[PDB]
């Protein structure tokens, strides 16, 4: 290479424009390469250490850069040269930059022979750990676990000291820092200390004055528990997690709840039925609706994980009592959360109990105002149909299904239409006919085109789920009656149903009573109804045999081409160059 | 040639604007069509009549999900397609694009905002550069706006305009007489038609807007009976409901921009006039 | 027993003819007491540094920067004034200083840092590059730069009147006439509303937030005062919304009663065990345990009590005075008219009354406690009520956090008074 | 109220 271009990149590092400055930072390998490896060590490094003063982007890159510079500096024997600049950057106010520096520090720590690692890298951690600036001290929290193993016990002794120190730091920043690295730290400590050190402090932070600090602890809970033998729990872990669930901060408690099952599956089925149930009970009855909601949206999976022996017993002696409440709750997000899974219970209490214990509730929910709630009560059918009577239900969601089928808020209506195809097969064909057919036929004459369009496309999927025969029974008779509706909208709705019912109803019925209409509609006064018939053919064309396609299909289409309506010509002449009847 | 529009529309439907090249040409095909239209465009029903859209494009999408998609459903828009919203460009182009494609399925009238002086101060102007770098696509439009029809007559019974009535206008022939191919004046009948508002204080009042006038029920009753009309169908003024009858059903206001400017929080509405001129209203909220 | 207050410095117009932009609107010492900041009607910020119980060196200009600039809403014929309403410092993160400044609609986090060196060594300083050279950092004359690092915008419908940082070193709140929002010092695109008292139908508007502060130590506590004269202590732990376990501080009439019952400022004592409040005629201390009545009530200028009418006629009844505590929550300061400011010792119970005036006193001159007469009679070395300049109000004052140093702002000038140590 | 040229 020629030097000019590199000379430029170097100068660029000290230039006004931030993008140029950012560019050279990104070509640092090519600068270090061009310099020696000893000049990189004696020239480029000193320079990059001073600075540590610009904007995120630049600093953030400089930090990431220095993380991949071990060989460029001269292999592991000099990886410690990299420390001054990374140390500097770890002091910066920007926590996104500090984050990188630490990340890089950890990376290159694994280039430190237990010697260096102990001769330089650990002094680093302590200088940071004991630094005047809380920024510095915050970054120390994340350098412990990467060098705990590879050092002498005298050292490990020290590291354990500093950490406990950082854990009692005057600044909530550091304390937070600490309580968050606790997890990855205990994971490198020998169970002795993990019970003598990690526990007392996971206990203190988890009971800090700073809400911010407490929830951070409660996270480590899980990581901590899975580093101790099941016996120890009740005395080391559970005392803390006990008060956490009783925490004054609705946020902390909320954490407990959202992390409930992750806890149980780490606290053992014993301690679960032991302590968690009395707790979980307190949550489902928490004053803060946000907590209750979180809880109620767990009740299902929490129960599917109780030891077989006690399970069915608590589910009905410990849980049920609280759910009877969570149904008549004032907060509709709570109720909405419950009803969305309250049904995953039956496949745990069997028929009888599901009929005298879950039905009175499952019923009381279904008849709730909030459309969101009763909307969930319908989403989870199969969920409980495989364990009880479809009719013992079909006599409860009578209005529920109707009510939603005709809510002022058309969105609500679109909501239930989405589910009729499923609610259908799960209620026989006759029930739909002698009940849910009146409603599925009312939507097709709905004011809102979206509901009409969504009730149309719904028919198709209401035959692939009921046989192309049932379509001729209690379906097309009406779809043809709409061709008589005095409104071209409600009328066009008829052609739209055909354009869809042809796709799945057999050429028999299709060319039977469905094609006779489309032809007759071609004489409709409203052009919007006329070109929508010329379109119905270019669509349904193929499904029909080349036989009928010649008979009266082209005669009409060639007639429409001869309409005085601009838009009717096009969809009749452009409708032929698609049916081969061109 | 058709090939492009079908596409242009499909593209604009996804909210993907057009090129200064494309626009400048669409505005051309548009002009030629719109001059062949009368100041009182004749429109046969059925038609879903719509009011103010003001660039709230996503809502214009929500409107089609309420009344239906074009050209399946005949549409009559009463002006104010640009300004206020953040998508005036994509909005006004979709519609002007549809008008050229389906000349007999859509009718676009002129709103008080489809003028130069206003588009500048109210957003369509800045938006234009902010999307093109130059004020050329704004000039091609403000120009096309001139050729827009001032009013419309549905079934020879329903009078549709953006603004309202004028003291210097009494019969439909007065309007047809007018020369609309010019910027919106600050005063005069043309101006009034696009600025007037109907209040509940008799006769002609001083428009608190600065342009046009305020007319009370008595004035409407006269105009309607004098021109054999059943109703005056207009927009221009936000109504919390989306639509609102006044002057004992002689006049009806239809606003089609829900939660105007994402601030005013109000309903939007369209009015369906069926095969036999039977009217129905559809109130919708802003698409989520 | 009384602090011997002495004149130390003056900053500003050597005379009268006050330039509007220059009128100071906020004054705040930093956590250490070394830095003293002010905020302009002109949107500027001036930081002063103490030359190097303890120190009593002069405060000299350390950094000046334009914090806010005007903004318009041409369609609404609206200008959002660049005036700096408040400044609140952040606790020392590292080598740099950080402060929050706000106007009616936008809060900005500023970084003030020192720089004593610069790079030297340009390779290209015509393609005669024989060698490559890396720049070296050489010592330069100290330089202080200020830069905005975070712009928290668009969260407020009404006028921002308060910004208070949480003890958590992480979040802070800002308040309108009707809303308080919670912010994270590093997230600028989202703000959580923790209080909203805006009536559904603005016509039924009956009360307005007036001030608001976080507890000095309790991460979950804050209070806000209203035009109605009522402080409300809130527990963010009690609920996600912060309305439960809410403690209203009230005291057991006339049209005026209401006007002078509006609280202009609220300040937690340093100990966080009490909180001072200020309304038109009085400063009154409250015990956080007792919310049925204050513990102390001091009268700042009772001679105006009879003047409520005139003061109402010329708007001064609406002037909003700020009040503050001395580090040890033992003495308490606030201001009045005719560049007079009061000081009450919660122990002694003795109160002083002083004047902020250049041509009246000079360097290290002990200040001469003032006195005011009735609406008719005059007296010896006292000033009559009917001779007070109600245009020379003192709304912004500040107290060093650990010394008997004091920043008093007059319309144009900024005075620094301290005792002899 | 967005500015009486029209909320
Ligand atoms: Mn208008
Ligand atoms: Mn309008």
From Swiss-Prot, chain A:
The keyword Transmembrane helix does not apply. It is found in: Cytoplasm; Nucleus; Chromosome; Chromosome, Centromere. Residues 40-314 are annotated as: Polyoma small and medium T antigens Binding. The modification N6-acetyllysine is found at residue 273. Keywords: Acetylation, Cell membrane, Cell projection, Centromere, Chromosome, Chromosome partition, Cytoplasm, Disease variant, Host-virus interaction, Intellectual disability, Membrane, Nucleus, Repeat. GO terms for molecular function: protein antigen binding; protein heterodimerization activity; protein phosphatase regulator activity; protein serine/threonine phosphatase activity. Residues 2-392 are annotated as: PP2A subunit B binding. InterPro entries: ARM-like (IPR011989), ARM-type_fold (IPR016024), HEAT (IPR000357), HEAT_type_2 (IPR021133), PP2A/SF3B1-like_HEAT (IPR054573), PP2A_Regulatory_Subunit_A (IPR051023). It comes from the Eukaryota. HEAT repeats lie at residues 2-39, 40-77, 78-116, 117-154, 155-193, 194-232, 233-271, 272-314, 315-353, 354-392, 393-431, 432-470, 471-509, 510-548, 549-582. Its main location: cytoplasm. One of its GO terms (cellular component) is glutamatergic synapse. Changing residue 251 to H: In HJS2; reduces PPP2CA binding; reduces PPP2R5A binding; reduces PPP2R5C binding; does not affect PPP2R5D binding; reduces PPP2R2A binding; reduces PPP2R2B binding; reduces PPP2R3A binding; does not affect phosphatase activity of PPP2CA. Residues 393-582 are annotated as: PP2A subunit C binding. GO terms for biological process: chromosome segregation; female meiotic nuclear division; intracellular signal transduction; meiotic sister chromatid cohesion, centromeric; meiotic spindle elongation; mitotic sister chromatid separation; negative regulation of hippo signaling; negative regulation of phosphatidylinositol 3-kinase/protein kinase B signal transduction. Residues 78-232 are annotated as: SV40 small T antigen binding. It is linked to Houge-Janssens syndrome 2: An autosomal dominant disorder characterized by global developmental delay, hypotonia, variably impaired intellectual development, poor speech, and dysmorphic facial features. Some patients may develop seizures. Belongs to the phosphatase 2A regulatory subunit A family. The gene is PPP2R1A.
Curated annotation (Swiss-Prot), chain B:
Its main location: cytoplasm. GO terms for cellular component: chromatin; chromosome, centromeric region; cytosol; extracellular exosome; FAR/SIN/STRIPAK complex; INTAC complex; membrane; membrane raft. Its cofactor is Mn(2+); Fe(3+); Zn(2+). The keyword Zinc applies. The active site is at 113 (proton donor). Gene3D superfamilies: 3.60.21.10. Mn(2+) 1 binds at residues 52, 54, 80. Changing residue 218 to H: In HJS3; decreased phosphatase activity in an in vitro assay; no effect on C-terminal methylation; no effect on the interaction with PP2A subunit A PPP2R1A/PPP2R1B; no effect on interaction with PP2A subunit B components. One of its GO terms (molecular function) is phosphoprotein phosphatase activity. One of its GO terms (biological process) is vascular endothelial cell response to oscillatory fluid shear stress. Transmembrane segments: none annotated. Carboxyl methylation influences the affinity of the catalytic subunit for the different regulatory subunits, thereby modulating the PP2A holoenzyme's substrate specificity, enzyme activity and cellular localization. InterPro entries: Calcineurin-like_PHP_ApaH, Metallo-depent_PP-like, PPA2-like, Ser/Thr-sp_prot-phosphatase. It is linked to Houge-Janssens syndrome 3: An autosomal dominant neurodevelopmental disorder characterized by global developmental delay with onset in infancy and additional variable features including hypotonia, epilepsy, brain abnormalities such as ventriculomegaly and a small corpus callosum, and autism spectrum disorder. PANTHER family: SERINE/THREONINE-PROTEIN PHOSPHATASE PP2A-RELATED. Belongs to the PPP phosphatase family. PP-1 subfamily. This is Serine/threonine-protein phosphatase 2A catalytic subunit alpha isoform. The lineage of its organism: Eukaryota, Metazoa, Chordata, Craniata, Vertebrata.
From Swiss-Prot, chain C:
The keyword Transferase does not apply. The keyword Ribonucleoprotein does not apply. Expressed in all tissues examined. One of its GO terms (molecular function) is protein phosphatase 2A binding. It comes from the Eukaryota. GO terms for cellular component: cytosol; glutamatergic synapse; nucleoplasm; protein phosphatase type 2A complex. Gene3D superfamilies: YVTN repeat-like/Quinoprotein amine dehydrogenase (2.130.10.10). Keywords: Acetylation, Repeat, WD repeat. SUPFAM superfamilies: WD40 repeat-like (SSF50978). GO terms for biological process: protein dephosphorylation; regulation of chromosome segregation; response to morphine. WD repeats lie at residues 4-68, 82-154, 155-198, 207-250, 263-300, 322-356, 389-421. Signal peptide: none annotated. Transmembrane segments: none annotated. Has an extended WD 2 repeat that is important for the interaction with PPP2R1A. Substrate-recognition subunit of protein phosphatase 2A (PP2A) that plays a key role in cell cycle by controlling mitosis entry and exit. Involved in chromosome clustering during late mitosis by mediating dephosphorylation of MKI67. Essential for serine/threonine-protein phosphatase 2A-mediated dephosphorylation of WEE1, preventing its ubiquitin-mediated proteolysis, increasing WEE1 protein levels, and promoting the G2/M checkpoint. Belongs to the phosphatase 2A regulatory subunit B family. PP2A consists of a common heterodimeric core enzyme, composed of a 36 kDa catalytic subunit (subunit C) and a 65 kDa constant regulatory subunit (PR65 or subunit A), that associates with a variety of regulatory subunits. Proteins that associate with the core dimer include three families of regulatory subunits B (the R2/B/PR55/B55, R3/B''/PR72/PR130/PR59 and R5/B'/B56 families), the 48 kDa variable regulatory subunit, viral proteins, and cell signaling molecules. Interacts with the PP2A C catalytic subunit PPP2CA. Interacts with the PP2A A subunit PPP2R1A. Interacts with TP53. This is Serine/threonine-protein phosphatase 2A 55 kDa regulatory subunit B alpha isoform.
């Amino acid at each position: 290479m020629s030097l000019y271009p590199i000379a430029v990149l170097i100068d660029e590092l000290r230039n006004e424009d931030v993008q140029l400055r950012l560019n050279s930072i990104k070509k640092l390998s090519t600068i270090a390469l061009a310099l020696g490896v000893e000049r990189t060590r004696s020239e480029l490094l000193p320079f990059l250490t001073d600075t540590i003063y610009d904007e995120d982007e630049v600093l953030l890159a400089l930090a990431e850069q220095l993380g991949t510079f071990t060989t460029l500096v001269g292999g592991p024997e000099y990886v410690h040269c990299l420390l001054p600049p990374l140390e500097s950057l770890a002091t910066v106010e920007e926590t996104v930059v500090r984050d990188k520096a630490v990340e890089s520090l950890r990376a290159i720590s694994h280039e430190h022979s237990p010697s260096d690692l102990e001769a330089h890298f650990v002094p680093l951690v302590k200088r940071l750990a004991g630094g005047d600036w809380f920024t510095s001290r915050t970054s120390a929290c994340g350098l412990f676990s990467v060098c705990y193993p590879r050092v002498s016990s005298a050292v490990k002794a020290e590291l354990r000291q500093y950490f406990r120190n950082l854990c009692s730091d005057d600044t909530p920043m550091v304390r937070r820092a600490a309580a968050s690295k606790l997890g990855e730290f205990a994971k490198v400590l020998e169970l002795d200390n993990v019970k003598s050190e990690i526990i007392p402090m996971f206990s203190n932070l988890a009971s800090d004055e700073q809400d911010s600090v407490r929830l951070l602890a409660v996270e480590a809970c899980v990581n901590i528990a899975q580093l101790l033998p099941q016996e120890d729990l009740e005395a080391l872990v559970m005392p803390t997690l006990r008060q956490a669930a009783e925490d004054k901060s609705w946020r902390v408690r909320y954490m407990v709840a959202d992390k409930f099952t992750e806890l149980q599956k780490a606290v053992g089925p014993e301690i679960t039925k032991t302590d968690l149930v009395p707790a979980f009970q307190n949550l489902m009855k928490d004053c803060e609706a946000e907590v209750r909601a979180a809880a109620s949206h767990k009740v299902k999976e929490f129960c599917e994980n109780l030891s077989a022996d006690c399970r069915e017993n608590v589910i009905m002696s410990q849980i049920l009592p609280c759910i009877k409440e969570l149904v008549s709750d004032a907060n509709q997000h709570v109720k909405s959360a419950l009803a969305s899974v309250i049904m995953g219970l039956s496949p745990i209490l069997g028929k009888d109990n599901t009929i005298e214990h879950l039905l009175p509730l499952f019923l009381a929910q279904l008849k709730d105002e909030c459309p969101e709630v009763r909307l969930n009560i319908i989403s989870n059918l199969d969920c409980v149909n495989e364990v009880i009577g479809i009719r013992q239900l079909s006599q409860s969601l009578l209005p529920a299904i109707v009510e939603l089928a005709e809510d002022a808020k058309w969105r609500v209506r679109l909501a239930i239409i989405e589910y009729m195809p499923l609610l259908a097969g799960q209620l026989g064909v006759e029930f739909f006919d002698e009940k849910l057919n009146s409603l599925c036929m009312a939507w097709l004459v709905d004011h809102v085109y979206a509901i009409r369009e969504a009730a149309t496309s719904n028919l198709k999927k209401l035959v692939e789920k009921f046989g192309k025969e049932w379509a001729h029974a209690t379906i097309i008779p009406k779809v043809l009656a709409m061709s008589g509706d005095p409104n071209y909208l409600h009328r066009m709705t008829t052609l739209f149903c055909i354009n869809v019912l042809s796709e799945v109803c057999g050429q028999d019925i299709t060319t039977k009573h469905m094609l006779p209409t489309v032809l007759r509609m071609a004489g409709d006064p409203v052009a919007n109804v006329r070109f929508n018939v010329a379109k119905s053919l270019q669509k349904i064309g193929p499904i029909l045999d080349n036989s009928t396609l010649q008979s009266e299909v082209k005669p009409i289409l060639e007639k429409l081409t001869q309409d005085q309506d601009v838009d009717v010509k096009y969809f009749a002449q452009e409708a032929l160059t698609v049916l081969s009847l061109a | 040639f058709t090939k492009e529009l079908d596409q242009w529309i499909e593209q604009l439907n996804e909210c993907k604007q057009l090129s200064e090249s494309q626009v400048k040409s669409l505005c051309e095909k548009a002009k030629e069509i719109l001059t062949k239209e009368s100041n009182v465009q004749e429109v046969r029903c059925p038609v879903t009549v719509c009011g103010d859209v003001h660039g709230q494009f996503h809502d214009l999408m929500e409107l089609f999900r309420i009344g239906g998609k074009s050209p399946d459903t005949n549409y009559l828009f009463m002006g104010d397609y640009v300004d206020r919203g953040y998508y005036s460009v994509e909005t006004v182009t979709l519609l002007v694009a549809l008008k050229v494609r389906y000349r007999e399925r859509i009718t676009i009238l002129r709103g008080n905002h489809e003028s130069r002086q206003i588009t500048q101060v109210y957003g369509f102007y800045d938006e234009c550069l902010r999307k093109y770098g130059n004020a050329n696509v704004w000039k091609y439009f403000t120009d096309l706006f001139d050729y827009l029809p001032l009013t419309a007559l549905v079934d020879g019974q329903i009078f549709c305009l953006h603004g309202g009535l004028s003291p210097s206008i009494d019969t439909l022939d007065h309007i047809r007489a007018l020369d609309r191919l010019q910027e919106v004046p600050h005063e005069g009948p043309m101006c009034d038609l696009l600025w007037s508002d109907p209040d509940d204080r008799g006769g002609w009042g001083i428009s608190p807007r600065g342009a046009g006038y305020t007319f009370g029920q008595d004035i409407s009753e006269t105009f309607n009976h004098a021109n054999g009309l059943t109703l005056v169908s207009r927009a221009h003024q936000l109504v919390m409901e989306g639509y609102n009858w006044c002057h004992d059903r002689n006049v009806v206001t239809i606003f089609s921009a829900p939660n105007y400017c994402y601030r005013c929080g109000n309903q939007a509405a369209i009015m369906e006039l069926d095969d036999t001129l039977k009217y129905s209203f559809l109130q919708f909220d802003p698409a989520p | 027993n009384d602090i011997q207050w002495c004149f130390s410095q003056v900053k500003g117009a050597v005379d009268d003819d006050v330039a509007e932009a220059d009128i100071i609107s906020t004054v705040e010492f930093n956590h250490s007491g070394e830095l003293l900041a002010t905020g302009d009607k002109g949107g500027r910020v001036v930081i002063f540094q103490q030359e190097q119980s303890h120190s009593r060196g002069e405060y000299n200009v350390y950094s000046t920067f334009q914090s806010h600039e005007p903004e318009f809403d041409y369609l609404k014929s609206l200008e959002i004034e660049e005036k700096i309403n408040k400044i609140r410092w952040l606790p020392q993160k590292n080598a740099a200083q950080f402060l929050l400044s706000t106007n009616d609609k936008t809060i900005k986090l500023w970084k003030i840092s020192e720089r004593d060196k610069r790079p030297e060594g340009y390779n290209l300083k015509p393609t005669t590059v024989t060698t490559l050279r890396v720049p070296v950092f050489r010592p330069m004359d100290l330089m202080v730069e200020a830069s905005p690092r975070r712009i928290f915008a668009n969260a407020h419908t009404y006028h921002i009147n308060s910004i208070s940082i949480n003890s958590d070193y992480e979040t802070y709140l800002s308040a309108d006439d009707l809303r308080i929002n919670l912010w994270h010092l590093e997230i600028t695109d989202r703000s959580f509303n923790i209080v909203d008292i805006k009536p559904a139908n603005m016509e039924e508007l009956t009360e307005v937030i007036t001030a608001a502060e976080f507890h000095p130590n309790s991460c979950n506590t804050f209070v806000y005062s209203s035009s109605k004269g009522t402080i409300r202590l809130c527990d963010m732990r009690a609920s996600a919304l912060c309305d439960r376990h809410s403690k209203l501080f009230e005291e057991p009439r006339s049209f005026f009663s209401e006007i002078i019952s509006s609280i202009s400022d609220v300040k937690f004592s340093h100990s966080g065990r009490y909180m001072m409040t200020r309304d038109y005629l009085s400063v009154k201390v409250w015990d956080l345990n007792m919310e049925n009545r204050p513990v102390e009530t001091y009268q700042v200028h009772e001679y105006l009590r009879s003047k409520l009418c005139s003061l109402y006629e010329n708007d001064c009844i609406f002037d909003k005075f700020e009040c503050c505590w001395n580090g040890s929550d033992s003495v308490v300061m606030t201001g009045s008219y005719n560049n007079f400011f009061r000081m009450f010792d919660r122990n002694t119970k003795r109160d002083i009354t002083l004047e902020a005036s250049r041509e009246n006193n000079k360097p290290r001159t002990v200040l001469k406690p003032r006195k005011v007469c009735a609406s008719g009679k005059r007296k010896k070395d006292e000033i009559s009520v009917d001779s007070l300049d109600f245009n020379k109000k003192i709304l912004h004052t500040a107290w060093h956090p650990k010394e008997n140093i004091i920043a008093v702002a007059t319309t144009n000038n900024l005075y620094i008074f301290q005792d002899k140590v | 109220x967005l500015x009486r040229x029209x909320x």
